Paper text:
Overall, TM2 binds to the same PBP in TEAD2 where palmitic acid (PLM) and other inhibitors target. The (2-cyclohexylethoxy)phenyl moiety of TM2 is surrounded by several hydrophobic residues, such as F233, L383, L390, F406, I408, Y426, and F428, enabling strong hydrophobic interactions, which is very similar to the interaction mode of TEAD with the fatty acyl chain of palmitic acid. Unlike palmitic acid with its head group pointing toward residue C380, the urea moiety of TM2 exhibits a completely different orientation and sticks into a new side pocket, which has never been reported before to be involved in TEAD inhibitor binding and is only accessible by rearranging the side chains upon TM2 binding. TM2 binding drives significant conformational changes in the side chains of residues C343 and L374, which makes space for TM2 insertion. Additionally, TM2 binding causes the side-chain movement in residues Q410 and Y333, which reduces the distance between the nitrogen atom of Q410 and the oxygen atom of Y333 from 4.9 Å to 2.7 Å to allow the formation of favorite electrostatic interaction. The surface electrostatics of the TM2 binding pocket also illustrated that the (2-cyclohexylethoxy)phenyl moiety inserts into a nearly neutral environment, while the urea is buried in a pocket bearing electronegative properties. It showed that all eight interacting residues in the new side pocket of TEAD2 were highly conserved among all the TEAD family members. Consistent with previously reported results, MGH-CP1, VT105, or K975 adopts almost the same binding mode as PLM and fits very well with the PBP.
The TEA domain (TEAD) transcription factor forms a transcription co-activation complex with the key downstream effector of the Hippo pathway, YAP/TAZ. TEAD-YAP controls the expression of Hippo-responsive genes involved in cell proliferation, development, and tumorigenesis. We previously reported that the mammalian TEAD transcription factors (TEAD1–4) possess auto-palmitoylation activities and contain an evolutionarily conserved palmitate-binding pocket (PBP), which allows small-molecule modulation. More importantly, structural and biochemical studies illustrated that the lipid chain of palmitate inserts into a highly conserved deep hydrophobic pocket, away from TEAD-YAP interface, which is suitable for small-molecule binding and suggests that lipid binding allosterically regulates TEAD-YAP activities.
Residue numbers in the entry: 222 to 239, 247 to 256, 266 to 308, 325 to 446
The structure:
Amino acid sequence: GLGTARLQLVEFSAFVEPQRHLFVHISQLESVDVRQIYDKFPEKKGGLRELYDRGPPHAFFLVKFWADLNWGFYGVSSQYESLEHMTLTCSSKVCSFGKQVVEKVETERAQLEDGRFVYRLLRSPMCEYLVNFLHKLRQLPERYMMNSVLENFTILQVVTNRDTQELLLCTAYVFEVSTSERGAQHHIYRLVR
Ligand SMILES: O=C(Nc1ccccc1)N1CCN(C(=O)c2cccc(OCCC3CCCCC3)c2)CC1
């Protein structure tokens, strides 16, 4: 789906609870040129461009969400799996108008489960910054204003092998807002050059 032979994303949701509301969701394939988006993330201090050339190009993905912003615990869940036992490092960078405003580094060790190696991060507190961002966003009176604010906002996520530092996955996230009758949606694209 979204990943490599070495690491597969199986689940991802961002949500709010009081039986829950998913802002965005991936459950479990066209291409895009990293060129079109180079200016959206950190300029050169280890951006989509420093990263992309260092390889390996098959690891880079673009994900466009159409978030459901009509609706408590603010959480994110993710689940990866692999056939090799690793400890994963996950750098997340939140970028607003190109400026990196947040960097988060997390770690997760493989748990063996049903012949596979599973990496789970279930109901982790959503970042301070995105929660507050969400509360300002929901008050805009028109979807096209939400999209205007969001066209300046991206998240770049880099998952590496912690004990080798091989890059396993690098995802760039861009966002729009869906309406009510259509809920969340995404499209996973592949970053080429
Ligand atoms: O896998 C993770 N850690 C991990 C730890 C060890 C090993 C592997 C992985 N994660 C934690 C960090 N993550 C995010 O902060 C994040 C990324 C994309 C969307 C998002 O929320 C969407 C909320 C807003 C966005 C703006 C308006 C619309 C809704 C949050 C991603 C998941």
